[PDB]
């Protein structure tokens, strides 16, 4: 009864779908670092040099491409020197944005950078422009990357790291329109131009610089930043949260009806319009697309769970959140020439997390499983997938009934992702494949019995992928019986 037709053009390959679209984001916020990543060398939670083993293994298994640290709003007040040297001598600071709680600085530059090397991931460092003078980020970059025998390099060596680390991405201010200094873009562009000057790449590696970009539909911000500074940036950040009910976040993460379901998906899909319009502005100043659009905060933002400190942003992660992730990956992959990095907010225990921990307990969220399903998209080639779908309507809201994307992976196999956004109606999908003879199709499905299903320590697999039985090939057509509220990932052979 819901019928979806489409075309896959394997013969019209497009741009690389960057692995950096699967970036993570670990702010010093709530238990995102302390408990979520760092437990300390003396913890009875099994750990490697203080990093909990369960989280390390889980993040390695989805091949995290980069982690942005330490913020976020925290980064615009962070002083990197507070986080180096003997732990006993590091100052206790106040985390002003996120509960006004004490920050021990036990997890600092060496602990984060060595964590990235343990995962085999890239570091995306967020520098302080709002409350520091430019010399702070200049010295931080030298400390981390200098191969010479300068005082800062020698101080890194004294602190136990002989060789430079790689710092491939460096954010030059975070949310400058808000928590980073309430700046008009005219002022922020001047500040960016100045502060970026003093972050210099040594001969031995290139540090790419990400300029502070718009929130939501702030097109004026993009216009000015690009007009004034496009020659001085390697990327421009944009931020868009999916916030059912609007700001401030009051929607339940655990308990919701179909109206809240469709509203959430409707809001998340706005990402496509935002990327389109911000990209078009970037094209006016940067037609060769040298500057990446960097979506370095996205995801859902709900009411805090009952009983939790609201400054710690703890929320559950349901099937709804899985669909949010699949729809955003689809959208990013459709804009792959310009959108070359993204970072979901946030990695562990905060906002739309991969993982929830509580002492030695750990659970993988439905969102984690979507990152796992879409692993073949990492550094794949975009393929055009054009779907002819009816709308799913509930009350005064409508969204596409089915959404999807496709790639040719580095192993040479074609993958098709499909999502059925309808809370109760299945769909029959028929995709005509051009440019590749088919014999077979294998797949996995992520769904659950109810839209509001989430994983817990006691029921860790309520939402988890299983083998999918509803895909078949006939002639040049892939036919899919796609259940309500589900995501499938199909591999053609």
The interface mask with its own copies, positions 245-284, x = CB under 8 A, is ----------------------------------------
Q: Which is nearer to its own copies, 88 or 458 (CB)?
A: 88
The token duo for 142 is 């030298």
Give 37's contacts (C-beta < 8 A, 6+ positions apart).
26, 51, 52, 55, 107, 115, 347, 348
Separation between Cα atoms, residue 367 and residue 487, nearest integer Å: 11
Instruction: Look at residues 156, 134, 133 and name the one whose alpha carbon lies nearest to residue 143.
Output: 156
Could you say which DSSP state residue 349 is in?
S
Q: Which of residues 163, 203, 288, 467 is near its own copies by CB under 8 A?
A: 203
Instruction: Look at residues 127, 124, 112, 159 and name the one whose alpha carbon lies nearest to residue 22.
Output: 124
Q: Does residue 218 interact with its own copies by CB under 8 A?
A: no
Angle at 169 between CA 166 and CA 170, to 5 degrees: 110
Q: Which of residues 31, 109, 116, 196 is near its own copies by CB under 8 A?
A: 196
Q: Which of residues 125, 146, 373, 402 is near its own copies by CB under 8 A?
A: 146
Least distance in angstroms from the C-beta of 63 to its own copies = 33
Looking at the chain, the residues that come just before a C–N gap of over 2.5 A are none
| Matching residue, tokens 């300390």 | 40
Q: Which is nearer to its own copies, 138 or 436 (CB)?
A: 138
Q: Which is nearer to its own copies, 183 or 487 (CB)?
A: 183
Helices H / strands E in the chain, number of each: 9, 28
Q: Which is nearer to its own copies, 181 or 390 (CB)?
A: 181
H/E stretch holding 220: helix 219-229
Per CB under 8 A, the segment of 181-189, 331-339, 375-383, 480-488 that binds its own copies is 181-189
Per CB under 8 A, the segment of 179-187, 251-259, 271-279, 350-358 that binds its own copies is 179-187
Instruction: Look at residues 162, 165, 183 and name the one whose alpha carbon lies nearest to residue 174.
Output: 183
* First-residue to last-residue Cα distance in the chain: 28
Angle at 251 between CA 453 and CA 266, to 5 degrees: 80
Q: Which of residues 32, 36, 134, 173 is near its own copies by CB under 8 A?
A: 134
Per CB under 8 A, the segment of 27-35, 54-62, 87-95, 438-446 that binds its own copies is 87-95
Q: Does residue 88 interact with its own copies by CB under 8 A?
A: no
Q: Does residue 193 interact with its own copies by CB under 8 A?
A: yes
Q: Does residue 132 interact with its own copies by CB under 8 A?
A: yes
Q: What does residue 277 show for φ and ψ, rounded to 5 degrees? A: -75, -45
**Catalytic machinery residues:** 175, 297
The residue ranges of DSSP E strands in 412-492, in sequence order, are 414-420, 427-434, 441-446, 466-467, 471-474, 477-482, 486-492
Q: Does residue 131 interact with its own copies by CB under 8 A?
A: yes
H/E stretch holding 204: none
Contact status, residue 217 vs residue 177, Cβ threshold 8 Å: no
Q: Which is nearer to its own copies, 196 or 365 (CB)?
A: 196
Q: Does residue 77 interact with its own copies by CB under 8 A?
A: yes
Total binding residues toward its own copies, as defined by CB under 8 A: 43
Q: Which of residues 7, 12, 53, 150 is near its own copies by CB under 8 A?
A: 150
Q: Does residue 296 interact with its own copies by CB under 8 A?
A: no
Q: Which of residues 9, 14, 56, 198 is near its own copies by CB under 8 A?
A: 198
Beta bridge partners of 291: none
Give 461's contacts (C-beta < 8 A, 6+ positions apart).
455
Separation between Cα atoms, residue 198 and residue 136, nearest integer Å: 10
Q: Which is nearer to its own copies, 128 or 455 (CB)?
A: 128
Per CB under 8 A, the segment of 124-132, 324-332, 405-413, 480-488 that binds its own copies is 124-132
Q: Which is nearer to its own copies, 146 or 387 (CB)?
A: 146
Separation between Cα atoms, residue 282 and residue 332, nearest integer Å: 16
Q: Which of residues 61, 92, 280, 440 is near its own copies by CB under 8 A?
A: 92
Q: Which of residues 194, 284, 290, 410 is near its own copies by CB under 8 A?
A: 194
Q: Which is nearer to its own copies, 150 or 461 (CB)?
A: 150
Separation between Cα atoms, residue 42 and residue 30, nearest integer Å: 21
Least distance in angstroms from the C-beta of 191 to its own copies = 8
Give residues in contact with its own copies (CB under 8 A).
77, 79, 91-94, 96, 100-102, 130-135, 138, 142, 146, 148-152, 154, 179-184, 187, 190, 193-194, 196-198, 200, 202-203, 228, 232
């Amino acid at each position: 009864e819901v019928k979806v037709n489409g075309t896959l053009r394997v013969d019209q390959p497009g741009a690389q779908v960057s692995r950096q679209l699967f970036g993570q984001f670990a702010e010093h916020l709530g238990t995102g670092i302390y408990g979520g990543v760092w437990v300390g060398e003396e913890s009875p939670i099994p750990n490697t040099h203080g990093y909990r083993n369960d989280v390390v293994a889980a993040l390695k298994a989805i091949a995290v491409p980069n982690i942005r640290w330490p913020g976020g709003c925290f980064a615009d007040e962070y002083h990197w020197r507070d986080g180096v040297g003997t732990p006993a001598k590091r100052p206790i600071r106040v985390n002003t944005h996120w509960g006004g709680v004490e920050e021990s600085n036990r997890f600092g530059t060496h602990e984060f950078m060595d964590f990235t090397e343990l995962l085999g991931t890239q570091a995306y460092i967020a520098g302080n422009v709002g409350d520091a003078a430019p010399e702070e980020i200049a010295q931080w970059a030298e400390y981390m990357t200098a191969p010479t025998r300068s005082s800062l390099a020698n101080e890194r060596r004294a602190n136990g790291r002989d060789a430079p680390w790689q710092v491939p991405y460096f954010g030059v201010g975070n949310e400058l329109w808000g928590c980073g200094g309430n700046m008009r873009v005219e002022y922020a562009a001047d500040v960016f131009r100045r502060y970026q000057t003093f972050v210099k790449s040594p001969a031995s590696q290139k540090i790419l610089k990400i300029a502070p970009g718009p929130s939501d539909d702030d097109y004026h911000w993009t216009e000015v930043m690009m007009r004034e500074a496009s020659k001085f940036m390697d990327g421009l950040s944009m931020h868009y949260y999916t916030i059912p009910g609007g700001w401030p976040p009051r929607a339940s993460s655990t308990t919701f009806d179909e109206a809240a379901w469709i509203q959430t998906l409707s809001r998340t899909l706005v990402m496509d319009e935002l990327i389109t319009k911000h990209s078009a502005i970037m094209d006016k100043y940067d037609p060769a697309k040298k500057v990446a659009l960097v979506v370095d905060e996205w995801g859902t933002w709900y009411a805090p769970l009952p009983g939790t400190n609201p400054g710690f942003l703890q929320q559950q992660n349901s099937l709804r959140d899985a669909l949010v992730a699949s729809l955003n990956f689809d959208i990013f992959s459709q804009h792959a020439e310009r959108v070359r990095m993204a970072n979901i907010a946030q990695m562990v225990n905060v906002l739309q997390a991969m993982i929830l921990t509580d002492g030695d307990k750990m659970v993988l969220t439905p969102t984690y499983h979507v990152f796992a399903l879409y692993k073949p998209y990492q550094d794949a080639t975009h393929l055009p997938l054009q779907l002819q779908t009816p709308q799913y309507r509930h009350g005064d809201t409508q969204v596409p009934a089915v959404h999807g994307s496709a790639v040719k992976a580095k192993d040479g196999h074609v993958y098709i992702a499909l999502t059925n956004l309808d809370a109760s109606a299945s769909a029959t999908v028929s995709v005509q494949v051009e440019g590749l003879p088919l014999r077979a199709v294998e797949g996995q499905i992520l769904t659950a019995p109810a839209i509001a299903t989430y994983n817990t320590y006691a029921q860790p697999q309520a939402v988890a992928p299983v083998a999918f039985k509803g895909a078949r090939v006939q002639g040049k057509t892939v036919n899919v019986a796609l259940p309500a509220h589900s995501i499938v990932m199909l591999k053609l052979q």
